[PDB]
Amino acid sequence: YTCCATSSRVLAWIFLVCILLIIVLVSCFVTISRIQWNKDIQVLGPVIDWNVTQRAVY
């Protein structure tokens, strides 16, 4: 009995901690990926000038 009761109590604490961490991990990923997309939108894009010499490959 006491080993079983103890195993049930310890099991529930670790199971609780497992889920509270997953909530956090997914909440961070959605935040960071969305912000990096906003930053990506506002970076300076490329420049073109029709210069062939500049794009030579030897």
Binding site: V52, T53, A56, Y58
Partner: peptide, 11 residues
């Protein structure tokens, strides 16, 4: 201007 030397097979 750009002057280049393309290799070609010769067997």
């Amino acid at each position: 201007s750009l002057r280049m030397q393309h290799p070609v097979p010769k067997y």
